[PDB]
Amino acid sequence: RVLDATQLYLGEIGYSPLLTAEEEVYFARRALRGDVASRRRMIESNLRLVVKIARRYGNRGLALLDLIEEGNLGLIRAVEKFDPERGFRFSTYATWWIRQTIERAIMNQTRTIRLPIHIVKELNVYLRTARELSHKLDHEPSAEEIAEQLDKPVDDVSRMLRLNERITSVDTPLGGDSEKALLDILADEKENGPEDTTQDDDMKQSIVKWLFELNAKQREVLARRFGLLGYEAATLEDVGREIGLTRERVRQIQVEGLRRLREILQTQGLNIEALFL
Amino acid sequence: DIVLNPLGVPSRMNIGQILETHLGMAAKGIGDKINAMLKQQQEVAKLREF
Amino acid sequence: GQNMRVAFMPWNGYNFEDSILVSERVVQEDRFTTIHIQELACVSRDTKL
Amino acid sequence: ARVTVQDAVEKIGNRFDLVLVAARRARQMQVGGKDPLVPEENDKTTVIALREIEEGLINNQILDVRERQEQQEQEAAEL
Amino acid sequence: EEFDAIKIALASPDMIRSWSFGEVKKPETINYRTFKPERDGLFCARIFGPVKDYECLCGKYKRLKHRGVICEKCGVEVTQTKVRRERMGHIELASPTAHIWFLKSLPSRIGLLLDMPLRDIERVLYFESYVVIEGGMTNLERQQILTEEQYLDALEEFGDEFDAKMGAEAIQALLKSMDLEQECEQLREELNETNSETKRKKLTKRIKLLEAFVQSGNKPEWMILTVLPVLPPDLRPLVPLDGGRFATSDLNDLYRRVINRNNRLKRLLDLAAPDIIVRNEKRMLQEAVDALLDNGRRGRAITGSNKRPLKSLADMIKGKQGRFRQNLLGKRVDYSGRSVITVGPYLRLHQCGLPKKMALELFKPFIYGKLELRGLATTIKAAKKMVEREEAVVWDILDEVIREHPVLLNRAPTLHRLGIQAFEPVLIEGKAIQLHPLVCAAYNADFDGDQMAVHVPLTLEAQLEARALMMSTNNILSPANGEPIIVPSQDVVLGLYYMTRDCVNAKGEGMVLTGPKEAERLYRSGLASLHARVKVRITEYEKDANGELVAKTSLKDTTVGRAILWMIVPKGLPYSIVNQALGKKAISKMLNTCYRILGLKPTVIFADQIMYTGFAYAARSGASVGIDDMVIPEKKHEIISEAEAEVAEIQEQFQSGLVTAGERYNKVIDIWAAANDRVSKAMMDNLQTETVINRDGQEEKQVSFNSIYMMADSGARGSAAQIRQLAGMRGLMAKPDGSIIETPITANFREGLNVLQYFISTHGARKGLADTALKTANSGYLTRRLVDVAQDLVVTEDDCGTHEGIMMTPVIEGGDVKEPLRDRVLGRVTAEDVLKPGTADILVPRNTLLHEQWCDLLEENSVDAVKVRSVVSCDTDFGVCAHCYGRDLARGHIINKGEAIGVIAAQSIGEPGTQLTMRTFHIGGAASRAAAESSIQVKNKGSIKLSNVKSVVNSSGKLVITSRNTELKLIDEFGRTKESYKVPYGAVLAKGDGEQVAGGETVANWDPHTMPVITEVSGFVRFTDMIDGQTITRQTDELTGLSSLVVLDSAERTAGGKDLRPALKIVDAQGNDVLIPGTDMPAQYFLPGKAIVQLEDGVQISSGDTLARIPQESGGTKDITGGLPRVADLFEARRPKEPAILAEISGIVSFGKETKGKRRLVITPVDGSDPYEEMIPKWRQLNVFEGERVERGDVISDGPEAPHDILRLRGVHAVTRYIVNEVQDVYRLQGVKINDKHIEVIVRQMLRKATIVNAGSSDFLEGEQVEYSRVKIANRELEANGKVGATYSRDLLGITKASLATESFISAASFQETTRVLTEAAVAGKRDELRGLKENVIVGRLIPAGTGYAYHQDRMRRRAAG
Amino acid sequence: HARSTGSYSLVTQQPLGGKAQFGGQRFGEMEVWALEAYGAAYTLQEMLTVKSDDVNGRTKMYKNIVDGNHQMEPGMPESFNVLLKEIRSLGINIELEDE
Amino acid sequence: RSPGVFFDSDKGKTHSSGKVLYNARIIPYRGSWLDFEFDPKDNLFVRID
RNA sequence: GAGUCU
DNA sequence: TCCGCGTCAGACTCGTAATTATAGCATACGTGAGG
DNA sequence: TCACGTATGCTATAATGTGGTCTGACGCGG
Ligand SMILES: [Mg+2]
Ligand SMILES: [Mg+2]
Ligand SMILES: [Zn+2]
Ligand SMILES: [Zn+2]
């Protein structure tokens, strides 16, 4: 017995009939015509080819059994759209599918933030150019050296090379054995600390008292425009919907509320003190 | 210049610091004699002898 | 480092447990004063915006 | 009371019930604004509470007496 | 929020979907350009929530105007971003996948329940072979594995007659079909016929499961997962690094593998692909799910980019870096800082220097609070800038808040509670903390750059807790030992020592002074030395029978300095206390005297005043350290040349081949070790009494005032041991092994070590410094284990009303009384009414504290032993009573209700092991054993009194002992044990039993480097099972040919003579055996391994002759490192390799039948006519000689006692005394002071559980071990109401097991074994009601002890009353 | 080094570590046993909740101290809430059965 | 550890009897290890890597 | 990974 | 007896931030704006 | 109805079973 998933699947596909020339045509003839037995024993037989193609495309994106799975899906589409009428072989035709299905599925799953087909194939043109430039410019090629070789924008070469930058994992230690990782250092900036939390409570509870302080028509008109006491942040012209119904008198009364409040901030001890903030 | 604790020596058993101090004293003692003879401006043959 | 006149004797427990009592004159001479050159970088990056 | 809290402990008994009684009285002067019995002498509400326990003025039972007095007086103004 | 308890169960497929708020059907995280949650991704906003507060993705609905609004466009709820860490999700797996915790975590759970091996289940999972779920005709057995070939057999023949399937589907259908009610009945009924041990163990565990599985409401279906839940996004975040790079958790990478393989599987099932392809995908799904849950468990862990494995979910719960140990039982804390500490010798004991800028950042909110009250700042933002500018007004307010506001100071490592103490801050100029010198001992803080942590107690409760409990002035005595930890050292001792000590004439001898102030007057005036003998008038206040102080004036013959020191001494102490020359040991007794006479206040002032004057006079003295102060004796080269010739003599006799290598090795070490003693005795004799002075008479002598000597004699720093290495001889250095290097260093540090002497010194240097780094972890792990078991234990009750206790005889071991009765019995409730010798008037009441006053009366009347109320003997169910524990050793008075004894007890044991691993290791270089115990010399006259001794007279005319544990007492005039010794086997006594001896008489004599085998009969020697080459070896010399025989053991022995036992059989002149007097035992002494024999076969012998000489190589210097494993093993309750056999029931012995050497004992007691039989090995020579009235727990085989056999036969008090004495002897070897009550605390927790033998009237019945506390609460109701009484037996448990046996699974999972605890609790459906401290520390509640004791019991009456 | 209030970690929601990050001090299990042993349960609960994880506790307590009132208004650490979700994601029902 | 052959022995760590089981290791700079070792019952055995 | 206090 | 799994002291300071490789072009699929 | 990024699709010489670390220890089950 062997309890490894890989050497077990490899044992199963081993005891499978390696098809000859008109054996492929004989089964594929009834496969396109639609046969239970043909599709299985064509696919079952040609699993041995998938493994070899998947073996060469390794240490790149997925592990290995993952390349075989996506490789087997390409072999199934090779069988659905094979043409036995043509004198050409199946191993020729299916090699195009298994290299294709694996290339195309690696491009998607290999990265954490999902990178599309266009941006990746864009990138491969820049990468193969870089290797040709590197052998004659000894040092690695710059983004301008690559951009200037293809006569394409410097921002476009920079954009795509920036997406190539891989993601560092949080659980990875800087220390070594068991000191600290990146979660132990990186701050939650979305949750503000008690100092910043209580300042907006004190700023906004200070303002609730300064509303009751100014005149009755001035703190009504000023508050409901900014949406401080009211429900929606309206404009000078939209304060007319309430009771004001004015354009000029609203603008004079809004500014009159702010002018009396500017002197309330110069006396309490802010104005230029709270201008820096 | 510095006042050290003598009780930081016997427990530690690092007596080289005390031999360093004694010899360091002797070393400065020669320096302070030569410094005095250069201030007094005695003689090149005298500095040679000492 | 630097060599200096050292007297081995206790002193009002200011040399309690290997605690050291140094003269103002050593600090005045700036002889144990150390230079610390410090490197801080300012980077203009490219954000989404 | 300043450094040494032994005399305060000798008066109640338990070191733990002492912290509970002293805190109760500290919180009355902190929020409620009750007047201190011993001269303040510029000390924190924590030390006043210990001083009052040390002298034998504040106690779990005495605090319940005085709480019932203020509570039930207001209950009588209602009823 | 508030709640009662927490419960664990299996997640039903139905239950997993309830937590989920959407299915993640895609592995996509974020769009690379527009950085947002993807469509039904891992970080989907539609499922887990919006990124900003109250904002949908598209941005149609913003802020609280739209409160509970789910956007129609993007599909996102307008709620707080908080919902992203709280909402979970799910994945509908196309095929079932086994949960790895309910498969691999042995016992297998899924396998134990199916009664099907784990190997057999895995074959089904990875699709190797089919399993029959329900074979219609019983041709195919249930749970029978069929191979892929064997499946094809049944398929054609039967077909539908059987339902055998493969994969997790088959194991789930197999768990579905099984009936727990029907199989459980069958297991019960079919156990009756056989009744063995391992069947009844495994079949009863299966019954316990099946019953618990039903009652837990769990189904065996849920062992296999059909649904897979998803962690919330914020808990596995994809956040941006400052630069454009991002970072993600390892769970995102494992979730993506599972979703990819699940989606691909659904597509391959849609494609109706061949099963070969489908199987591979099902295997990969199991691998990805098992890797998500627990990565490194089933197979090789899935590594990511870094080569390290991806951290799984289990990993963030399990072990050290799990949530429990790192983010829940311990925390990062606000209002904390640290810095380099330095001295503060001006400070008072209740004070500490706290830097300006530290205190400014520490007390920020209190400053903003005062700034609004004084009217200086309008808002907090305004107050923030005032403080940031560091305005002059702000320093004044900072000063205002800090007065009377304590700060906590902490040092690593926090070994005991005194590692944190509270102080009143003093603002200082610099950036460094100033620590009070006297508390330095508790922290173990030397100023060579230590750092100490600062904590602000914010709440008023915390300010009062800091001031009342944790204040430095409140914490003077050690909780470990009733002795002051606040004790002057270093300069302070040296200064009072220099002050008090007298000297010949000096300035102004035989003067007469008016008072202690005129003594200071003549000293400061410069007319008298501190050492001048002078008559002085001093008035001492001694305390009367009542509280009042009585004043007494008298002329005192003391020095000037002693008069000056009396000024510090408070009124209450006699003048006799400062009349001696004071050292460290005496000054410690001064504050202990003062604490018990006066109180706390006087001691705090006295301790300070001692500190101040001690430092000051140390500085006055100008005591120093020079190279001339290290005097070497003139006769050192004389001693070495003699000792060199002695060692050269044994080495020359070794070349001849007279003495062996092992004998020379031990013999040479004894010569050098005594030479080091000789040089050191000559050094301290030429150092101590070297000062010879001329008095005003003619000439006399006194102790030397050599500066180094004063420093070691006073006990300020160093000792005579260190001075050997400085002036005398360096000594034998220790190998890294522990064994002693044969060449010791002759030279010392003043003379200087040469190239080789240094190289030898380094062997022992590195090994010491190595234990300081490595072995501290074995010791510190003991601290941890001890705390987890004792954790929950708190004083609950005032008085249990129990009448029981442990009888404490005084530890008189090895000549001098090592620990008086007084010390051991002090601060303990008198269990029974213990009066004076004349039993006719009670002397001490049964329920009374043992104050030093009562303890002094015990010495007057000579109370020998006293029964004392112990913690173990408490009959409290809930915790322990105040009476049973007795005095809080730290406080010197009765312990309070609510104080947590468990943790205090664990810390007191754990601390000295842990810290002493770092103490004599950094300091340690040299080896200094002296295990050359050749002979006992009795010191007082007495009658010789042996016990547990069986000797026989020899040819010489000498009482030779033939018993292993022989003790020798020393009986005085009236009849009481004064001295006690261990006389070993084969020892020669001077006088036999009952004979009078004088003082200074060698009463016993023997050879230490050999364990002889001595005969009991006379005649000739016969060789039995002593074949040359198989069992023994042989080596001869020359001319004549003397050969020695060396017995080989199983190590140096072939497979030929393994079951052969080599023994020197005794025979007479005829050739027959010689019977041992009064027994049917033919004389036969079994020789063990490596036993050297000089007498060959056919040699005449008398009784008392030595047959063979077993070597005794133990040259290891016993430090903490060699004793701690012993302590660990005792607390863990491990049987040794050779446990001594003990008699189970009292009655008449009859020896029985035999098995080819192995003995049987069919003992038939007088009352119990039914017999008890037990097998005994061949080689164990028995102490009991058969046909004898033997009682419970009588030593039959000699050797070490299993603590299980002690508790089983001789009750609780016996095993408690075994653990206390055995553990404490290890700490006593190292001079570590731990009260017995602290060991007794942990022993109580070891004696937690109990196995129920006879049936009860509940659901205990038989075999089920339950806690002691629970079965007694049942027995209280049973004794009154009636029905079947439950007979019981208390079981002993090790620490690691007793901790896991606790009902609180949260305590268990936080300790160790996190993976196993959670699964066993999940399947039993256990509910933890949060009992102990760990549970409430986790949930972030008030401790149910200490200050919160009162609060937790107040909630408990709310629960009772409705 | 010294810190009153500062940044908080992402998952644990505890203070950061070290002066390099301006972080609070670690109060380990060793340090927890000390206050356990004394009896000071308020000193401990302070450091377990309002100084550490308790989000409503830390902001509210900051405001209590600025108001002057040194009031203990605690809750339950977010690190426990994390433990619950991490155990539930393992496929283990863990729930708060209340009073 | 230098490459080459090095003979070594578990003293009393192997087994309960304390049979000193002698062993050998041929250590290359690159390639598989070659171990030879005894058993309690004095039979020679081979293990690679 | 290199340190600092035990 | 042999294989497997489980533990292994407590804080602190610093320091840095990597690699690979996936072809090329034509119709198909979805949303938003403009006529 | 195009504009634009994203996705799906097909290539016919034959090709058909995979390939980093190597040493802990002391305890305690099954
Ligand atoms: Mg020191
Ligand atoms: Mg230190
Ligand atoms: Zn929307
Ligand atoms: Zn009791």
Tab-separated table of N, CA and C in Angstrom, chain E residues 4 62 133 343 464 527 562 592 639 691 786 831 841 851 888 890 911 935 1034 1058 1061 1100 1105 1111 1122 1173 1286 1289:
chain	number	residue	atom	x	y	z
E	4	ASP	N	-23.189	33.620	31.472
E	4	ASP	CA	-23.062	32.628	32.558
E	4	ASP	C	-21.928	31.654	32.214
E	62	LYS	N	-24.692	56.641	1.263
E	62	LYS	CA	-23.611	57.012	2.224
E	62	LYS	C	-24.182	57.525	3.556
E	133	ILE	N	-20.665	-0.832	3.770
E	133	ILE	CA	-21.429	0.041	4.706
E	133	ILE	C	-22.491	-0.816	5.392
E	343	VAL	N	20.300	53.609	40.823
E	343	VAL	CA	20.030	53.671	42.293
E	343	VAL	C	19.212	54.908	42.666
E	464	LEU	N	-6.095	52.129	44.790
E	464	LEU	CA	-6.240	51.627	46.184
E	464	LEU	C	-5.610	50.239	46.297
E	527	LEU	N	37.820	62.497	68.447
E	527	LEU	CA	38.486	62.221	69.734
E	527	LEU	C	38.235	60.761	70.038
E	562	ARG	N	28.583	51.769	68.272
E	562	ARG	CA	27.395	50.995	68.714
E	562	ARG	C	26.405	51.930	69.408
E	592	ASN	N	13.203	41.543	61.495
E	592	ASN	CA	12.202	40.513	61.880
E	592	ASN	C	11.777	40.676	63.349
E	639	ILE	N	52.226	22.964	51.452
E	639	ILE	CA	51.034	22.067	51.432
E	639	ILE	C	50.980	21.382	50.069
E	691	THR	N	45.706	40.226	62.718
E	691	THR	CA	46.021	41.521	63.356
E	691	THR	C	46.523	41.202	64.765
E	786	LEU	N	3.231	24.155	37.671
E	786	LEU	CA	2.759	24.231	39.074
E	786	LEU	C	1.626	25.253	39.146
E	831	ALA	N	-4.080	21.245	65.440
E	831	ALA	CA	-5.117	20.275	65.024
E	831	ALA	C	-5.785	19.682	66.267
E	841	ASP	N	-3.338	18.607	82.282
E	841	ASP	CA	-3.820	20.000	82.058
E	841	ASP	C	-3.492	20.381	80.605
E	851	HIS	N	1.529	31.729	67.442
E	851	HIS	CA	2.339	32.970	67.476
E	851	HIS	C	3.710	32.619	68.054
E	888	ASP	N	-0.628	34.013	56.724
E	888	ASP	CA	-0.008	34.467	55.460
E	888	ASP	C	1.451	34.779	55.779
E	890	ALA	N	3.685	36.163	54.219
E	890	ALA	CA	4.156	37.500	53.798
E	890	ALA	C	3.638	38.553	54.774
E	911	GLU	N	10.211	29.592	41.882
E	911	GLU	CA	11.110	30.769	41.788
E	911	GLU	C	12.529	30.334	42.094
E	935	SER	N	33.163	8.345	58.339
E	935	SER	CA	32.830	7.869	59.704
E	935	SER	C	31.949	8.897	60.402
E	1034	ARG	N	37.748	-12.100	33.343
E	1034	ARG	CA	38.889	-12.537	34.188
E	1034	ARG	C	40.189	-11.917	33.663
E	1058	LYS	N	21.691	-14.045	29.655
E	1058	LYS	CA	20.750	-12.944	29.999
E	1058	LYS	C	19.883	-13.367	31.192
E	1061	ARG	N	21.284	-15.487	36.573
E	1061	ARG	CA	21.608	-14.518	37.672
E	1061	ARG	C	22.895	-14.923	38.386
E	1100	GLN	N	37.530	-20.291	51.965
E	1100	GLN	CA	36.900	-20.330	53.313
E	1100	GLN	C	36.544	-18.904	53.772
E	1105	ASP	N	32.374	-11.263	56.420
E	1105	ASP	CA	33.402	-11.013	55.376
E	1105	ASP	C	32.739	-10.394	54.144
E	1111	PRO	N	31.414	-0.807	42.886
E	1111	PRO	CA	31.936	0.558	42.811
E	1111	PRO	C	30.856	1.625	43.057
E	1122	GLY	N	20.764	19.152	39.032
E	1122	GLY	CA	20.697	17.688	39.237
E	1122	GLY	C	19.565	17.293	40.171
E	1173	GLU	N	-2.616	-12.414	46.572
E	1173	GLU	CA	-1.437	-13.029	45.917
E	1173	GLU	C	-0.726	-11.966	45.076
E	1286	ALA	N	-21.921	5.288	48.242
E	1286	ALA	CA	-20.868	5.106	47.213
E	1286	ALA	C	-19.491	4.946	47.874
E	1289	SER	N	-12.151	5.450	46.456
E	1289	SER	CA	-10.691	5.412	46.717
E	1289	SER	C	-10.065	6.653	46.089
